[PDB]
Design a protein around this ligand. Structure first.
Ligand SMILES: Nc1ncnc2c1ncn2[C@@H]1O[C@H](COP(=O)(O)OP(=O)(O)OP(=O)(O)O)[C@@H](O)[C@H]1O
Ligand SMILES: Nc1ncnc2c1ncn2[C@@H]1O[C@H](COP(=O)(O)OP(=O)(O)OP(=O)(O)O)[C@@H](O)[C@H]1O
Ligand SMILES: Nc1ncnc2c1ncn2[C@@H]1O[C@H](COP(=O)(O)OP(=O)(O)OP(=O)(O)O)[C@@H](O)[C@H]1O
Lengths: 311, 311, 311
């Protein structure tokens, strides 16, 4: 099999214009603020499993590498607020990820804020990439905790730094509660999945570049009107499901060695990674079942609101 | 880009007569009280994102600079109460802000008040500026806590000093609860946003002075009946949204160098900072869409009551 | 402006026959009790911003000054109970006010009582004054806590001294609950605001004495049939509102120096102190409108019951 081929098969990153826009907006949002006046700020929406973490890692790799290699600078962070997050727990994390491992033994929203606001300029933070806000909305109850959003408002008033605050599109409610919290985070973005299935667009070139990035030296197997339609039929929007199917196909192709990912391992790959899909969803690969046009309607505008619309 | 141009592009402060009145009333309220008799006291209302913090910063810059440069005096303060504020938390913040970091570890509304009342005359405080009262009114429940109000009453009764107590216009309910605290703070002010859109008033001269403050040497582009109506069409009252559009528009003129902020960067800058706006609100810049007179009505009298009228 | 003029302008205290009655009754209440038999006791009702604290401070200044100048005697005490008062917290305040810093760190209704009872005769307390009974009644619920009143009964039974217990009139409800506490506090008083507005009464002589106390050398400007009714229209009962208007007027007179407080600064003074007044109230000074006799009806019998009658 060889570790490098499977490694490169898993790490086959190509950039959709949405990702390029987000990377440009991040680079902008970083370059704009001079760590003196009130920062510009930003919020990304996206959905459940599109590539938010991957975009953050891609940004971290190009940005933080050379600065971190020099010494203890770490210009950019990676935060992930816990389940039913409180300002203590957020600030505890903000400290934990930022160099110093101390201030987690016995601190209760007193001196941790002061030392965090004192050390942020000293260490040299130029941006904060917060990843998680799905937790601030409660699971059963329709209530949303504001304490964290207010604490973010206060630390943003105290120390000046751009904040990116990634979170599912139902997390908008978190901002809608507190007036100027909605007001402050003005610049806003959708990282929504692929809409059109027909081809000769973003999906076709994405699969073409992906097939160029795949480990097999016998050219692209995908980018054909017959095959592309079934891949969209399998994975509607979620790039996770698509990349999983491609990965499962690739490892099935290198196993009992083949030249390309031909129409024989896709049926197994599809049957394998069809656990997360609903009962209503149908597998296009399972048998001789012709893909239907009505099934390939674009993903709803309420794509990441399902968890919120449960209650 | 050059940091100085972008710094001066961000920091382009001009004073509307409302701000001048607040600065005059602040100067008055400080000059009146002689730290012996009962103080005159003051409350500023305003709304969510008009210029409350900026008015306080402008006052702090002109007042506190020369005094603070001398030594440990700090004649004026800046306080910001936490979410669901309690007298312990407000007093802890009052002490934490006042130089000395002690009385932070273990104090339970016992000796912190006595030492605060003892040290306030010693350091030489001439006025206090409390910023935030939105927290005292609960999010879900209609209840408003008066513990902080009675502590403010008690500390005002014990030690004599002017207090400015900023807070969004639904914060009035905090005063309306406690009969004395309503009667104590007699001097009252609106820092409400701009009303008229047509021109030849406060908005036109504000934009004209802002254009004179902008970094471009090729004169003013704004303050024209053709253009300035769309700026009011974009941002009804909130100066935040206007200044954000101006900043992004300016940034987009420095990037791929231009002479002035002409009608080409405004469209993308408008599309950029159209996240905080409601779904009902329409973008005038997006396409060839002529602004409608009915949309340019003045902002409602209940401008900062929405959060209260939710519940 | 000068500190002496503004100091004397603020500190312009003249005595109302009601104040003289309270002063006489308090002097009597002190003189009668010999710290051996059961004390005579007293309760003063008043209302919000009439002059209870000023009467207490006047009494403190005339009585305690000579005794305090001699040494550690402090014959008379000042207490102002915390919000949602408990016997431990009242006793803590009663101790920390009277010299001793200790009995503050760790005391839970155990030894503070005995040491208070032991050292009250030693230091030589001839009378006690509690400022507020609003805290015993809850904000939301109509329920009243008896613990503080029962502790007052208990400590009155143990250490026998006069207790004056000032508090806004619906505080009567606190005594209406506990019959024995009601029985003890027999001597009772209204410190009610000014009722008559016609002229040639307590209001005219009060204003004349105030004008004699004002800093301007060239005789009284007020106490005229033209101005008295307008001053009464502005401030119905509340002496706070009246004295605030007089103060603000006096400042607007000494600023851009005039000969006297003319009826050109009263419009600004009235406009400035127009925050705490309800929407139903109409400002007489604002425009050139003749004041209506119907609006100058005397204030109601339940003047300081509104906040209690809300629920
Ligand atoms: N341009 C791209 N080319 C190829 N694969 C991509 C690209 N962008 C994202 N992916 C893949 O899509 C998947 C995104 O998963 P990821 O965990 O980043 O999603 P997420 O929305 O952040 O979810 P999570 O809640 O797990 O953080 C990964 O398998 C990643 O490799
Ligand atoms: N006279 C002025 N000229 C130009 N810009 C101004 C002027 N006054 C205020 N601004 C700008 O308007 C904005 C005011 O934001 P500020 O933080 O004061 O709002 P706020 O009402 O205190 O809200 P919050 O504290 O909830 O964030 C800033 O961008 C500030 O630079
Ligand atoms: N005889 C008097 N002549 C002139 N001014 C007076 C007189 N008595 C009281 N005042 C003034 O009336 C005001 C009374 O304020 P004070 O703090 O005593 O109010 P209060 O009724 O005790 O209310 P609270 O304790 O709830 O604040 C002060 O401005 C005081 O100077």
């Amino acid at each position: 099999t060889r570790e490098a081929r499977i490694s490169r098969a898993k790490r086959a990153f190509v950039s959709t214009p949405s990702v390029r826009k987000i990377l440009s907006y991040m680079d902008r949002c970083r370059d704009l603020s001079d760590l003196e006046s009130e920062p510009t700020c930003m919020m990304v929406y996206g959905a459940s499993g599109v590539g938010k973490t991957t975009v953050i890692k891609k940004y971290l790799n190009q940005n933080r590498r050379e600065s971190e290699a020099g010494g203890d600078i770490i210009p950019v962070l990676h935060i992930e607020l816990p389940d039913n997050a409180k300002p203590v727990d957020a600030a505890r994390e903000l400290l934990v990820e930022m160099g110093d491992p101390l201030a987690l033994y016995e601190t209760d929203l007193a001196r941790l804020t002061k030392r965090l606001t004192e050390l942020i300029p000293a260490v040299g933070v130029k941006l904060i990439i917060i990843d998680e806000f799905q937790h601030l909305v409660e699971e059963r109850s329709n209530r949303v905790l504001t304490q964290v959003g207010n604490w973010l408002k206060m630390i943003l008033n105290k120390t000046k730094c751009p904040i990116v605050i990634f979170g599912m599109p139902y997390s908008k409610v978190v901002l809608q509660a507190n007036s100027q919290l909605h007001g402050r985070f003005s610049i806003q973005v959708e990282l929504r999945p692929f809409s059109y299935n027909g081809g000769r667009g973003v999906f076709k070139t994405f699969l073409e570049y992906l097939d160029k990035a795949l480990p097999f030296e016998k050219q692209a197997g995908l980018a054909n009107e017959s095959l592309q339609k079934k891949l969209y039929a399998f994975s509607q929007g979620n790039m996770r499901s698509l990349r999983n199917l491609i990965y499962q196909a690739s490892i099935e192709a290198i196993d009992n060695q083949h030249e390309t990912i031909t129409e024989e391992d896709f049926v197994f790959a599809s049957k394998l990674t069809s656990g997360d899909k609903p009962n209503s969803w149908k597998n296009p690969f399972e048998e001789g079942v012709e893909v239907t046009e009505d099934m390939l309607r674009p993903p709803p505008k309420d794509i990441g609101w399902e968890d919120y619309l449960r209650h």
